[PDB]
Amino acid sequence: ERFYEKXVQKFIRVGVTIREK
Incomplete structure (x- = not known):
């Protein structure tokens, strides 16, 4: 699926x- 979490990942x-x- 999709995953977006923040060093930004x-x-x-x-x-x-x-x-x-």
């Missing part, structure tokens, strides 16, 4: 899953 993933910036 991103996660969008729908390929396994990954998060960044």
Whole structure:
């Protein structure tokens, strides 16, 4: 699914899953 949390993390993933910036 989608993920938004903040150094900003991103996660969008729908390929396994990954998060960044």
